[PDB]
């Protein structure tokens, strides 16, 4: 016979129904006599341990503006917003937990892992020290999810580093093996709304921001392995693409003259001063600079006001860390040098102002030629597989064999090896130790790229430049000094999680458009527990 927990990990981790499992159970029990799979209600009672809302816990002090109950389940996402005919119209459905009650189950599911970490790091298993938990938040619109459009946004988090302050220093009691994968970012709220429908987006995400600002100055006491233990938290909201950090932190839209969400520069100025910047955009500076926008205390006109406020025009309402995404940086660089391949087919340094017909021919011969050489699939939107496959030396040497002139051969090969020399020190999840020498050589490695853009490629990069290339040069040797890692602080897990939403949506629903957003949340919670993923490595352990 089996535990209820193993067959729970089965029925979740291979997407059976609420009824197909009954067929499998009744056939196995009818054939082999003994029951091997636990029945349905005995599975359902074993769900409730793993959901949020089962265990006692308390805060020091009790939290301001938070209800103190411990027996909350899934709560409605509107936070009791009245949806009446007399007032503003809302039509979105959103579901969520609380934020404390999710962190409770997120810490208590990794109980064996932090205890075994305490064992392996030579410390008392009967310890009750003040742990610090580092939580990374993520949020993305994952729209066009309908069936025979409609958009949806999940806001989600990730337990990433649990660290005690023992004696004179700290120890990594728990560290996450694979940070940016799909099975270790846990769903916290989900909504059916546009990711730029700013009213409803703010109206749902403001409770979680309130609770997050609440639990930044308290402690959690929790019965953890016999004795109780205490946790304090540190939040870093990082899982955002350029659009969402550009929006909810309240800058201008993405086509602004002011580019960087970390420093303050213009593209007519960034294209000359390439690497002398720093991080000069906080969240509090952003908030008070919105205030000095709104007051206009000097009475200057709009065009130099926006010069003084450096292109802030809105009230930010979500504290983010100013930090790059890892995935979308690589996708942007990939599509950029794919377009520069398409342009250098035409060799337009010889003749400028080419027609808007021959460029389509350059695209067509690029796609046909790279399908001939390396078998790239003719697509439009660059996915992750296409992004990984385009940045090889074989393809640039192939199109180098396509292009006529000789200086373009050195100009593309040297650039490709410089870029691949730059790539893994942001691509890695711990590049401070894995390639720790080119990490130190990165300054020269970057300014050579910069000088050969500004000299041998000055036909295009004398005026405008794009966004992500400014982030690659200007910031990442300082981001490794501040935060350390790069690729761990990405949204790749959150970006990968979206297929699970669709599969859960068309395989587990009750067709009411209100419980339909309950059960996808419940199943996605039951997916990403580490108490059940420990069972799916039993054939590896």
């Amino acid at each position: 016979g089996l535990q209820p927990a193993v067959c729970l990990a089965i029925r979740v981790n291979t997407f059976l129904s609420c009824s197909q499992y009954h067929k499998m159970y009744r056939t196995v029990k009818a054939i082999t006599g003994r029951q091997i799979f636990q029945p349905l209600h005995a599975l359902r009672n074993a769900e409730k341990v793993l959901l949020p809302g089962y265990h006692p816990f308390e805060w020091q002090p009790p939290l301001k503006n938070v209800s103190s109950r411990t027996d909350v389940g899934i709560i409605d996402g509107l936070s009791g917003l009245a949806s009446s005919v007399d007032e503003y119209p809302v039509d979105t459905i959103a579901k969520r937990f609380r934020y404390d009650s999710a962190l409770v189950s997120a810490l208590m599911d990794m109980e064996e892992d932090i205890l075994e970490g305490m064992r392996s790091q030579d410390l008392d298993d009967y310890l009750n020290g003040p742990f610090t938990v580092v939580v990374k938040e993520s949020c993305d619109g994952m729209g066009d999810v309908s069936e025979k459009p409609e958009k949806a946004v999940r806001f989600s988090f990730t337990v990433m580093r649990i660290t005690i302050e023992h004696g004179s220093q700290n120890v990594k009691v728990f560290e996450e093996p694979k940070p940016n994968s799909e099975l270790c970012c846990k769903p916290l709220c989900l909504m059916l709304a546009d990711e730029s429908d700013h009213e409803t987006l703010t109206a749902i995400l403001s409770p979680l921001i309130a609770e997050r600002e609440a639990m930044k100055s308290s402690e959690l006491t929790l019965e953890m392995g016999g004795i109780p233990r205490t946790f304090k938290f540190i939040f870093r909201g990082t899982g955002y693409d350029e659009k969402l950090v550009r929006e909810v932190e309240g800058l201008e839209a993405s086509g602004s003259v002011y580019i960087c969400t970390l420093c303050d520069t213009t593209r007519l100025e960034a294209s000359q001063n390439l690497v002398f910047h720093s991080i000069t955009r906080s969240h509090a500076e952003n908030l008070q600079r919105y205030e000095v926008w709104r007051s206009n205390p000097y009475h200057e006109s709009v065009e130099e006001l926006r010069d003084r406020v450096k292109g802030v025009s809105a009230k930010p309402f979500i504290e983010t860390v100013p930090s790059i995404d890892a995935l979308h940086c690589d996708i942007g660089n990939a599509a950029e040098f794919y377009k520069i391949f398409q342009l250098e087919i035409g060799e337009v340094y010889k003749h400028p102002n080419a027609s808007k017909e021959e460029r389509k021919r350059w695209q067509a011969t690029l796609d046909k030629h790279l399908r001939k050489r390396m078998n790239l699939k003719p697509i439009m939107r660059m996915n992750g597989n296409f992004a990984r496959k385009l940045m090889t030396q074989e393809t640039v040497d192939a199109v180098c064999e396509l292009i006529p002139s000789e200086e373009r051969h050195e100009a593309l090969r040297e650039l490709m090896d410089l870029y691949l020399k730059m790539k893994p020190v942001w691509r890695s999840s711990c590049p401070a130790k894995e390639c720790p020498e080119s990490l130190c050589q990165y300054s020269f490695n970057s300014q050579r790229f910069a000088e050969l853009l500004s000299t041998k490629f000055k036909y295009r990069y004398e005026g405008k430049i794009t966004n992500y290339f400014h982030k690659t040069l200007a910031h990442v040797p300082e981001i490794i000094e501040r935060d350390g890692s790069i690729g761990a602080w990405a949204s790749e897990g959150n970006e990968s999680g979206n297929k699970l939403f669709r599969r859960f949506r068309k395989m587990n629903a009750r067709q009411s458009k209100c419980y339909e957003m309950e059960d996808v949340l419940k199943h996605h919670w039951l997916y990403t527990s580490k108490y059940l993923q420990k069972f799916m490595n039993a054939h590896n352990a």
Partner: protein
């Protein structure tokens, strides 16, 4: 009884329910866009003109000295025609905070019909109200002097009962009356005995020394009563005085739309009778120096969508002209965000 269908410019997307339409000098201006102000129209307030049922939301700019203000989504506006200007207070910002500032909105310049606005953040000092929306404010006169009378709408829960499962829950404000002087911006609250219930989305008429309030929803009882209230106000050189009276024969409609089609004769159009029954009829309120009354007009004709949609919204353009909006059915040939109509009553 003159319905007319309107077509739209290139950016229909700057519409949203609960906007604000300001009438300056015959010109019409739009304030309260959807979302934060874009880069093509940085003030978020527009010269809104309509030629041959086609409208051109052109951007409007501000003065040297103005204070750029966020697009409120249900504010309280009134007409300080004493230069000509408007007063904005309250509303709900894009981040669903509730503002409580005073915004003095006037014309700074107009050269070759290119308008130039100036708004100033008049701050309230003294017995301020809580920040709220769905409230109303009228300007009023007595004995060479003038004041602002403010009656409340609804707001959030207070700062102690804000739990994060009721974080966007709302309750009616206290039935107080707020007297405001704008020479210093001083605020005096007043408790008044004949008003018992909180009211929201009501209609306020200022007959030059007396404000009549008709309609509006009471959320805590979850009904829309048919009670109108006449409020007499007078200021001596010492402390001013207020008075309330209940005059029977009102109408039970929340969030109707008012305009002035005649002097001492106003006109309200269709709102909501019940939560499922909208107000289909439309009324001409014949005012008076002391005695006012309310009669019906000759039932303006609608179309299929207006008789078919669940909701409507809109405001008045100022010159006897009502602007209305309609959601439109989504399960269609990718139908537009909103449809638009103009009502004219001659």
């Amino acid at each position: 009884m003159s319905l007319q269908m309107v077509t739209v410019g290139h950016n229909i997307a700057l519409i949203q329910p609960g906007f604000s339409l300001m009438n300056f000098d015959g010109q019409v201006f739009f304030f309260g866009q959807k979302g934060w102000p874009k880069r093509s129209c940085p003030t978020g307030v527009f010269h809104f003109d309509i030629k041959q049922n086609h409208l051109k939301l052109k951007p409007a700019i501000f003065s040297k000295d103005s204070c750029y203000l966020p697009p409120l989504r249900y504010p309280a506006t009134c007409s300080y025609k004493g230069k000509h200007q408007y007063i904005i207070h309250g509303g709900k910002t894009p981040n669903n905070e509730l503002s409580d500032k005073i915004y003095i909105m006037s014309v700074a310049c107009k050269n070759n019909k290119k308008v130039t606005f100036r708004c100033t953040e008049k701050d309230l000092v003294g017995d301020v109200p809580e920040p709220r929306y769905g409230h109303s404010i009228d300007v009023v006169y007595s004995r060479g002097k003038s004041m602002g009378v403010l009656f409340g709408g609804r707001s959030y829960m207070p700062s102690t009962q804000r739990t994060t499962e009721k974080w966007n829950s709302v309750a009616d404000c206290l039935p107080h009356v707020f007297l405001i002087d704008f020479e210093f911006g001083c605020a005096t609250s007043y408790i008044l005995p004949e008003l018992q219930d909180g009211l929201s989305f009501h209609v306020s008429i200022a007959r030059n020394d007396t404000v009549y309030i008709l309609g509006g929803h009471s959320l805590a009882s979850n009904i829309r009563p048919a009670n109108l209230y006449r409020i007499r106000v007078d200021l001596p050189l010492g402390t001013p005085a207020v008075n309330c009276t209940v005059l029977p024969g009102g109408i039970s409609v929340s969030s109707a739309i008012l305009t002035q089609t005649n002097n001492d004769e106003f006109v309200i159009v269709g709102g909501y009778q019940l939560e499922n029954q909208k107000r289909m009829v439309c009324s001409l309120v014949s005012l008076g120096d002391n005695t006012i009354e309310i009669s019906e007009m000759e039932t303006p004709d609608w179309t299929s969508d207006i008789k078919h949609s669940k909701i409507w919204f809109g405001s008045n353009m100022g010159n006897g002209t009502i602007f209305l909006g309609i959601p439109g059915d989504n399960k269609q040939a990718m139908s537009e965000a909103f449809y638009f109509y103009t009502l004219r009553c001659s």
